[PDB]
Amino acid sequence: GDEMVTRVVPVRNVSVRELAPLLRQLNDNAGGGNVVHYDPSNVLLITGRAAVV
Amino acid sequence: GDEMVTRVVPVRNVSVRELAPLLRQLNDNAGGGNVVHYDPSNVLLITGRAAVVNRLVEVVRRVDKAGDQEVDIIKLKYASAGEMVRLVTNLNKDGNSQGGNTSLLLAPKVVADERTNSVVVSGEPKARARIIQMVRQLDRELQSQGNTRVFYLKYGKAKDMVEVLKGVSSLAISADETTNALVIT
Amino acid sequence: NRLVEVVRRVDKAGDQEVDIIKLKYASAGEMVRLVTNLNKDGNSQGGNTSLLLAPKVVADERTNSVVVSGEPKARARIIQMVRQLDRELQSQGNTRVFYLKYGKAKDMVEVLKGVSSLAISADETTNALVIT
């Protein structure tokens, strides 16, 4: 539920760059403590509580 | 806990430049005494108290393991690595692009060796997962009927027939004078 | 104290060393070709990426040695890739020799040359066909 952990899924098919408004918007969706960021290697790395993640 | 130490993790997969807002923001997250900075040689160097650095280095190894790009080699026993290459090369955007913000030049790519007949992958574990499937998809053998057949002619002479068929081709023919058979491909 | 801390830090923050370990089996040049298609292992013109300063891959065919230039994460994953492609052949090679029993190797070469026209020779002595 409130468990703050970092977990990482790539978007292989597409450049993950297209989820930057979306997922940092999901940081911006509810109570913070979140990180979203993007590799040109096109893996999408996350940090946050269990639900937001 | 409050132990102020410097420790350094590279992001090999990606240029570490992308954690500059994030990690100096983690300086900016709580009570200061922090340093974050970046080598173009793409190691990420930190200074700070034990916790702030716990979640900093968390970010760094994370971004590091976020974008894996390893190679897997498994032997192909059957269909040609070069045909394997050609057919899959037309799978453009399996890492083969000039995409800008996409950066698809950092995405998984496909290869093969014809000395061992080995598929070569370079990229993601999703690429390991799906290209071990594509290894298996084309590692199929021939079923009896090949590309090349040999016709045993009974009443016709193979050497004379070659000339006849050469017109039709003019496809690659020779006739074996001994067994009087025609080898066309 | 904490200035020079920053400096040695930024110094070890972007490591770039080389590692040389012998390949015993499959060709360094093939090793080169197959990995060269791993573009973005240091092989790019990327701006703020600066991937021209990221790890790159090489080989020698005189010792048959892999050469790396970059990170220890590159040492870690390219010593894996050394081992992945350093596998030997399993009995069946690229080239086979067929012993023909009722057919003559020199005569068969010309027959097969059509099929190829793939690289053939026939040994007059043991009357065998060597195709690759």
Residue numbers in the entry:
A (entry chain G): 97 to 149
B (entry chain H): 97 to 266, 292 to 306
C (entry chain I): 150 to 266, 292 to 306
Direct quotes from the study:
Pathogenic bacteria commonly employ the Type II Secretion System (T2SS) for the release of protein toxins. The system includes an inner membrane platform of GspC-E-F-L-M, a periplasmic pseudopilus composed of GspG-H-I-J-K and the outer membrane secretion channel GspD, called the secretin. In numerous species the targeting, assembly and stability of the T2SS secretin in the outer membrane require the function of a small lipoprotein that binds to its C-terminal region (the S-domain) and serves to pilot secretin monomers from the inner to the outer membrane via the LOL lipoprotein sorting pathway. In this study we used cryo-electron microscopy to characterize the structure of the secretins from V. vulnificus and A. hydrophila and in addition determined the crystal structure of EpsS from V. vulnificus.
First, we determined the cryo-EM structure of A. hydrophila ExeD as the paradigm of a secretin that is assembled through the actions of the ExeAB accessory complex. Analyses of top views of class averages revealed that, for both secretins, symmetry is unambiguously pentadecameric (C15 symmetry). The resolutions of the resulting symmetrized maps were estimated to be in the range of 3.4 Å for EpsD and 3.7 Å for ExeD by employing the gold standard FSC criterion. In ExeD, the sequence corresponding to the β-hairpin is absent and the structure is finalized by the β-lip, a common feature seen in both structures. The inner membrane ExeAB complex is both necessary and sufficient for the assembly of ExeD; in accordance with this, the Aeromonads do not have known pilotins. However, sequence comparisons reveal that ExeD does contain a recognizable S-domain including residues that could potentially correspond to helix α-12, a fully solvent-exposed, 8-residue helix that has been reported to bind pilotins in analogous regions in other secretins. In our ExeD sequence, for example, the conserved Ala-Phe motif is absent and is replaced by Lys-Gln, residues whose high polarity would not be able to play the same roles of the two hydrophobic amino acids of the motif. In addition, in our cryo-EM structure of ExeD, the last visible residue in the electron density map is Asp620. This indicates that the C-terminal tail, which includes the region discussed above, is flexible and not traceable and most probably does not fold into a stable domain. In contrast, however, the ExeD-EpsD-S variant, in which the EpsD α11 helix-containing region was also exchanged into ExeD, was both assembled in lower amounts and significantly compromised in function once assembled, suggesting that the interactions between this helix and the neighbouring monomer that are evident in the cryo-EM structure play an important role in both the assembly and the function of the secretin.
